[PDB]
Coordinates of C-alpha atoms in Angstrom, one line a residue:
Chain A
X1 CA -25.4 -24.5 1.8
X2 CA -25.1 -25.1 5.6
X3 CA -27.4 -28.1 5.7
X4 CA -24.5 -30.4 4.7
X5 CA -21.6 -28.8 6.4
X6 CA -22.6 -28.5 10.0
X7 CA -22.2 -32.1 11.2
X8 CA -18.6 -32.3 10.1
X9 CA -16.7 -29.9 12.4
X10 CA -18.5 -31.5 15.4
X11 CA -16.8 -34.7 14.3
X12 CA -13.5 -33.4 13.3
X13 CA -12.4 -30.3 15.3
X14 CA -10.3 -30.1 18.3
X15 CA -8.5 -26.9 19.3
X16 CA -5.4 -25.9 21.1
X17 CA -5.0 -24.5 24.6
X18 CA -2.3 -22.5 26.3
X19 CA -2.8 -21.2 29.8
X20 CA -6.5 -22.0 29.8
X21 CA -7.1 -19.9 26.7
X22 CA -8.0 -21.1 23.2
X23 CA -6.3 -19.5 20.3
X24 CA -6.0 -22.0 17.4
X25 CA -7.8 -25.0 16.0
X26 CA -6.8 -28.5 15.0
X27 CA -8.0 -31.1 12.4
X28 CA -7.9 -34.8 11.9
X29 CA -7.6 -35.7 8.2
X30 CA -7.2 -39.0 6.5
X31 CA -4.5 -40.8 8.3
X32 CA -2.4 -38.0 9.9
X33 CA -3.5 -35.4 12.4
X34 CA -2.9 -31.8 11.6
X35 CA -1.7 -28.8 13.4
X36 CA -0.5 -25.4 12.1
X37 CA 2.5 -24.9 14.3
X38 CA 2.4 -21.1 14.3
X39 CA 0.4 -20.9 17.5
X40 CA 1.9 -22.1 20.8
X41 CA -0.2 -24.4 23.0
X42 CA -1.3 -27.9 23.9
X43 CA -4.2 -29.8 22.4
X44 CA -7.3 -30.0 24.6
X45 CA -7.3 -33.8 25.0
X46 CA -5.8 -36.1 27.5
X47 CA -3.8 -38.6 25.7
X48 CA -2.7 -37.7 22.1
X49 CA -0.6 -34.8 23.3
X50 CA 1.8 -37.6 24.3
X51 CA 2.7 -38.1 20.6
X52 CA 5.6 -37.8 18.3
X53 CA 5.8 -34.7 16.1
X54 CA 7.8 -33.8 13.0
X55 CA 8.5 -30.1 12.5
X56 CA 9.8 -28.0 9.6
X57 CA 9.6 -24.3 10.0
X58 CA 9.9 -24.0 6.3
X59 CA 6.2 -24.6 6.0
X60 CA 5.0 -23.9 9.5
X61 CA 3.0 -27.1 9.7
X62 CA 2.9 -30.1 12.1
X63 CA 1.6 -33.6 11.8
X64 CA 1.4 -36.8 13.7
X65 CA -0.2 -40.2 13.2
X66 CA -3.6 -41.0 14.7
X67 CA -3.7 -43.9 17.1
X68 CA -6.1 -46.6 16.1
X69 CA -9.0 -45.8 18.5
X70 CA -10.6 -42.8 16.8
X71 CA -9.0 -43.4 13.4
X72 CA -12.4 -43.8 11.8
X73 CA -13.5 -40.2 12.5
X74 CA -11.7 -38.2 9.8
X75 CA -13.1 -36.7 6.7
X76 CA -12.6 -37.5 3.0
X77 CA -10.2 -35.6 0.8
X78 CA -9.1 -35.2 -2.8
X79 CA -7.0 -33.0 -5.1
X80 CA -9.3 -32.5 -8.0
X81 CA -10.2 -28.8 -7.9
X82 CA -12.0 -27.0 -10.7
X83 CA -12.9 -23.4 -10.1
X84 CA -16.2 -22.6 -8.6
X85 CA -18.1 -22.1 -5.4
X86 CA -16.8 -23.5 -2.1
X87 CA -17.8 -23.2 1.5
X88 CA -16.5 -22.7 5.0
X89 CA -17.4 -21.8 8.6
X90 CA -18.4 -18.3 7.7
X91 CA -20.1 -18.6 4.4
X92 CA -19.2 -19.3 0.8
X93 CA -15.9 -18.8 -0.9
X94 CA -15.0 -18.4 -4.5
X95 CA -11.8 -19.6 -6.2
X96 CA -10.1 -19.2 -9.6
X97 CA -6.8 -18.5 -11.1
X98 CA -4.9 -20.0 -8.2
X99 CA -6.6 -17.2 -6.1
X100 CA -9.1 -17.7 -3.3
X101 CA -11.5 -14.9 -2.4
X102 CA -14.1 -13.9 0.2
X103 CA -15.4 -10.4 1.0
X104 CA -14.0 -8.0 3.6
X105 CA -13.0 -8.7 7.1
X106 CA -15.1 -11.6 8.1
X107 CA -12.1 -13.3 9.6
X108 CA -10.0 -12.4 12.6
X109 CA -6.7 -13.0 14.2
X110 CA -6.8 -16.0 16.5
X111 CA -8.6 -18.0 13.8
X112 CA -6.0 -20.3 12.1
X113 CA -7.1 -23.9 11.5
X114 CA -10.3 -23.7 9.5
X115 CA -10.7 -26.4 6.9
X116 CA -12.6 -25.7 3.7
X117 CA -14.8 -27.9 1.6
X118 CA -16.6 -28.7 -1.6
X119 CA -20.2 -29.4 -2.3
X120 CA -20.1 -33.1 -2.5
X121 CA -18.3 -33.7 0.7
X122 CA -14.5 -34.2 0.9
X123 CA -12.3 -31.7 2.7
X124 CA -10.0 -29.6 0.5
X125 CA -7.5 -27.4 2.3
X126 CA -6.6 -25.3 5.2
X127 CA -6.1 -21.6 6.0
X128 CA -3.4 -19.6 7.7
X129 CA -4.0 -15.8 7.8
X130 CA -5.2 -12.8 5.9
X131 CA -4.3 -9.9 3.5
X132 CA -5.8 -6.5 2.9
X133 CA -7.6 -6.0 -0.4
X134 CA -10.0 -3.2 -0.6
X135 CA -13.2 -5.3 -1.1
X136 CA -12.7 -9.1 -1.4
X137 CA -10.0 -10.6 0.7
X138 CA -6.9 -12.6 -0.1
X139 CA -6.2 -15.8 1.7
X140 CA -3.2 -17.8 2.8
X141 CA -3.7 -21.6 2.3
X142 CA -1.5 -24.7 2.0
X143 CA -2.7 -27.4 -0.4
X144 CA -1.9 -30.5 -2.3
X145 CA -0.8 -31.8 -5.7
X146 CA -1.5 -35.4 -6.8
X147 CA 1.7 -36.1 -4.8
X148 CA 3.1 -33.1 -3.0
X149 CA 2.1 -30.4 -0.5
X150 CA 2.6 -26.7 -1.4
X151 CA 2.3 -23.3 0.2
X152 CA 1.1 -20.2 -1.6
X153 CA 1.6 -16.8 0.0
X154 CA 0.5 -13.7 -1.9
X155 CA 2.1 -10.4 -1.2
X156 CA 1.1 -8.1 1.6
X157 CA -0.3 -10.4 4.1
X158 CA -0.3 -10.7 7.9
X159 CA 0.3 -14.0 9.6
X160 CA -2.7 -14.7 11.8
Chain B
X1 CA 43.2 -7.6 67.7
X2 CA 40.9 -9.9 65.8
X3 CA 38.7 -10.4 68.8
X4 CA 37.8 -6.8 69.0
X5 CA 37.6 -6.0 65.3
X6 CA 35.1 -8.7 64.3
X7 CA 32.6 -7.9 67.1
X8 CA 32.5 -4.2 66.4
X9 CA 31.8 -5.0 62.7
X10 CA 28.9 -7.1 63.6
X11 CA 27.3 -4.9 66.1
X12 CA 27.3 -2.1 63.6
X13 CA 25.8 -3.8 60.5
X14 CA 22.8 -5.4 62.1
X15 CA 21.7 -2.0 63.4
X16 CA 22.1 -0.8 59.9
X17 CA 20.1 -3.9 59.0
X18 CA 17.7 -3.0 61.8
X19 CA 17.2 0.6 60.8
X20 CA 16.2 -0.3 57.3
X21 CA 14.0 -3.1 58.5
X22 CA 11.4 -1.1 60.4
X23 CA 11.4 2.0 58.3
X24 CA 10.0 0.2 55.3
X25 CA 7.1 -1.4 57.2
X26 CA 6.1 2.1 58.3
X27 CA 6.1 3.0 54.6
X28 CA 4.1 -0.1 54.1
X29 CA 1.4 0.8 56.7
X30 CA 1.5 4.5 55.7
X31 CA 0.8 3.5 52.1
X32 CA -1.2 0.3 52.1
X33 CA -4.9 1.4 52.5
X34 CA -4.4 3.8 49.6
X35 CA -3.6 0.8 47.5
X36 CA -6.9 -0.8 48.2
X37 CA -9.6 1.5 47.0
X38 CA -11.0 1.7 43.5
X39 CA -9.6 5.1 43.1
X40 CA -6.1 6.4 42.8
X41 CA -6.4 9.7 44.6
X42 CA -3.0 9.7 46.4
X43 CA -2.4 13.0 48.1
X44 CA 0.7 15.1 47.8
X45 CA 2.6 13.2 50.5
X46 CA 5.6 12.5 48.3
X47 CA 8.4 12.2 50.8
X48 CA 7.6 8.5 51.0
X49 CA 8.3 7.4 47.4
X50 CA 4.8 7.3 46.1
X51 CA 3.8 5.0 43.2
Chain C
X1 CA -37.0 -5.3 43.6
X2 CA -35.4 -8.3 41.9
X3 CA -36.1 -7.2 38.3
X4 CA -33.0 -4.9 38.3
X5 CA -30.6 -7.0 40.3
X6 CA -30.5 -10.4 38.7
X7 CA -28.4 -9.7 35.7
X8 CA -25.5 -8.3 37.6
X9 CA -24.1 -11.2 39.5
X10 CA -24.1 -13.3 36.4
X11 CA -21.7 -10.7 35.0
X12 CA -19.7 -10.1 38.1
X13 CA -19.3 -13.1 40.3
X14 CA -16.6 -15.8 40.3
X15 CA -16.1 -17.9 43.4
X16 CA -13.2 -19.8 45.0
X17 CA -12.4 -23.4 45.0
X18 CA -10.3 -25.6 47.2
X19 CA -10.2 -29.4 46.7
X20 CA -13.1 -29.3 44.3
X21 CA -15.4 -27.6 46.8
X22 CA -16.7 -24.1 46.7
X23 CA -16.8 -22.1 49.9
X24 CA -16.4 -18.4 49.2
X25 CA -17.2 -15.9 46.4
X26 CA -15.3 -13.3 44.5
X27 CA -16.1 -9.9 42.9
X28 CA -14.7 -7.7 40.3
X29 CA -15.2 -4.0 41.0
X30 CA -14.1 -0.9 39.2
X31 CA -10.4 -1.4 38.5
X32 CA -9.3 -3.9 41.1
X33 CA -10.5 -7.4 41.6
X34 CA -11.6 -8.4 45.1
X35 CA -11.3 -11.3 47.4
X36 CA -11.9 -11.6 51.1
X37 CA -8.8 -13.5 52.2
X38 CA -10.5 -15.3 55.1
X39 CA -11.2 -18.4 53.2
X40 CA -8.5 -20.6 51.7
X41 CA -8.7 -21.6 48.0
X42 CA -8.1 -20.9 44.4
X43 CA -10.3 -18.9 42.0
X44 CA -12.2 -21.0 39.5
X45 CA -10.6 -19.6 36.4
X46 CA -7.6 -20.6 34.3
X47 CA -5.4 -17.5 34.1
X48 CA -6.0 -14.8 36.6
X49 CA -4.9 -17.0 39.5
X50 CA -1.4 -16.3 38.1
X51 CA -1.6 -12.8 39.5
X52 CA 0.1 -10.6 42.1
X53 CA -1.6 -10.2 45.4
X54 CA -1.1 -7.7 48.3
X55 CA -2.2 -8.9 51.7
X56 CA -2.7 -7.3 55.0
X57 CA -4.2 -9.4 57.8
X58 CA -5.2 -6.2 59.6
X59 CA -8.2 -6.0 57.4
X60 CA -8.5 -9.6 56.0
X61 CA -9.0 -8.4 52.4
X62 CA -7.2 -9.1 49.2
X63 CA -7.0 -7.3 45.8
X64 CA -5.3 -7.5 42.5
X65 CA -5.5 -5.5 39.2
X66 CA -7.7 -6.8 36.4
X67 CA -5.9 -7.6 33.1
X68 CA -7.2 -5.6 30.2
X69 CA -9.3 -8.3 28.5
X70 CA -12.4 -8.5 30.8
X71 CA -11.8 -5.1 32.3
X72 CA -15.1 -3.8 31.0
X73 CA -17.3 -6.2 33.0
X74 CA -17.3 -4.6 36.4
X75 CA -20.0 -2.7 38.1
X76 CA -20.4 0.9 39.2
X77 CA -19.8 2.2 42.6
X78 CA -20.0 5.3 44.8
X79 CA -19.7 6.4 48.4
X80 CA -22.8 8.5 48.8
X81 CA -25.0 6.7 51.2
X82 CA -28.1 8.1 52.8
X83 CA -30.2 5.8 55.0
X84 CA -32.9 3.7 53.4
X85 CA -33.8 0.5 51.7
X86 CA -31.1 -1.5 50.0
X87 CA -31.0 -5.0 48.5
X88 CA -29.0 -8.2 48.2
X89 CA -29.0 -11.8 47.1
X90 CA -31.6 -12.8 49.7
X91 CA -33.9 -9.9 49.9
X92 CA -34.0 -6.3 51.0
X93 CA -31.8 -4.8 53.7
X94 CA -32.3 -1.7 55.8
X95 CA -29.6 0.7 57.1
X96 CA -29.3 3.5 59.4
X97 CA -27.1 4.9 62.2
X98 CA -24.0 3.2 60.9
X99 CA -25.9 -0.1 61.5
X100 CA -27.0 -2.6 58.8
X101 CA -30.0 -4.9 59.5
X102 CA -31.9 -7.9 58.1
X103 CA -34.1 -10.4 59.9
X104 CA -33.0 -13.6 61.4
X105 CA -30.8 -16.3 60.1
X106 CA -31.3 -16.0 56.4
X107 CA -27.5 -16.2 56.0
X108 CA -25.2 -19.1 56.6
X109 CA -21.5 -19.9 57.2
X110 CA -19.8 -20.5 53.9
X111 CA -21.3 -17.3 52.4
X112 CA -18.7 -14.5 52.4
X113 CA -18.4 -12.4 49.4
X114 CA -21.8 -11.1 48.7
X115 CA -22.0 -7.5 47.3
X116 CA -24.9 -5.2 48.2
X117 CA -26.5 -2.6 46.1
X118 CA -28.7 0.5 45.9
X119 CA -31.8 1.0 43.8
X120 CA -30.3 3.1 41.0
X121 CA -27.5 0.6 40.2
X122 CA -24.0 1.1 41.6
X123 CA -22.5 -1.4 43.9
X124 CA -22.0 -0.4 47.5
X125 CA -20.2 -2.7 49.9
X126 CA -19.3 -6.2 50.8
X127 CA -20.1 -8.6 53.7
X128 CA -18.0 -10.8 56.0
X129 CA -20.0 -12.7 58.7
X130 CA -22.9 -12.6 61.2
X131 CA -23.9 -11.8 64.7
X132 CA -26.8 -13.0 66.9
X133 CA -29.5 -10.5 67.6
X134 CA -32.8 -11.9 68.8
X135 CA -34.8 -10.7 65.8
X136 CA -33.0 -8.6 63.1
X137 CA -29.4 -9.5 62.5
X138 CA -26.2 -7.6 62.7
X139 CA -23.8 -7.6 59.8
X140 CA -20.0 -7.3 59.3
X141 CA -19.1 -5.2 56.3
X142 CA -16.1 -3.2 55.0
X143 CA -16.8 0.0 53.2
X144 CA -15.5 3.3 51.9
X145 CA -15.0 7.0 52.6
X146 CA -14.5 9.5 49.9
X147 CA -10.9 8.5 50.1
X148 CA -10.4 5.6 52.5
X149 CA -11.5 2.0 53.2
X150 CA -12.8 1.1 56.6
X151 CA -13.9 -1.9 58.6
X152 CA -16.7 -1.9 61.2
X153 CA -17.2 -4.9 63.5
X154 CA -19.9 -4.8 66.1
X155 CA -19.6 -6.8 69.3
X156 CA -20.5 -10.5 69.6
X157 CA -20.0 -11.7 66.1
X158 CA -18.8 -14.9 64.4
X159 CA -16.5 -14.8 61.4
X160 CA -18.1 -16.7 58.6

């Protein structure tokens, strides 16, 4: 379950810096580069911080377009999502009923920006923060239609 | 009348300014080695506005 | 004699930089962070150079207070000091009569900031520069009472 995943984040993860102290993460998906605008900071690369950004606080997301040099270094993606096992940086996640789950407390504050996958390779979606549960946690993810983006935010959460 | 009143005003205030100027640096030197140790055992010498 | 010492400086030593060129060293002791202010430069870390500093040229020392993140990474310390063997980064040092000794020339200019220990673990004191001797060298150390700090500077020395 880890033998397919591990190569990917080495290709596709930058993170953010503010005052020489990492806090968030950043991804590069498809054609547009991604940042969850909740955390303050600057990306840890020389040039592409010089870029245009389009912000709406209604979703708390942020994109820009990748310049043509490292454009061929992003993952694959789709919208087809039957229920079943899926995977991430700290194990395997289950999903059904419009509800994502993983057991208790294996995520921390200071950890936004973690993409989540399938088995057969494309990237799926992207996490925000957590919510108390008793046993198996609630998530906070933004995702896609065939055509549109959408937030879902269940009750009783904390914004990481 | 002016020529007296301005000179007496300026000889008084700098001495006010002098008096405060050296009293603090005594409070500095009387305090400062106590700031340095890894240990906050300041004695009861509070007449000198202890931290 | 080295089997207890070696882990400590890896936990407790930063050094100074000025123009991309190390010259001094820096320690983190107890509650207050330490720098011998003789050498110019900036510490080689992102954030804690943004700190308050209190300087007296009468001693040529410099402290600040450690922010609460890496506060639990400093050594232990005491003031009880009978005469006997003690140890440091280049061997074993002997002390008596208010006089520290080590044999010839095993220290250089560009080496201020080296803490010195006991056997049983706490840190003791901190060095400044050297003095010619014939055979076994003279030191230049600042140290502690039960309550106060104190410099001792024997005749005929050179400030490293």
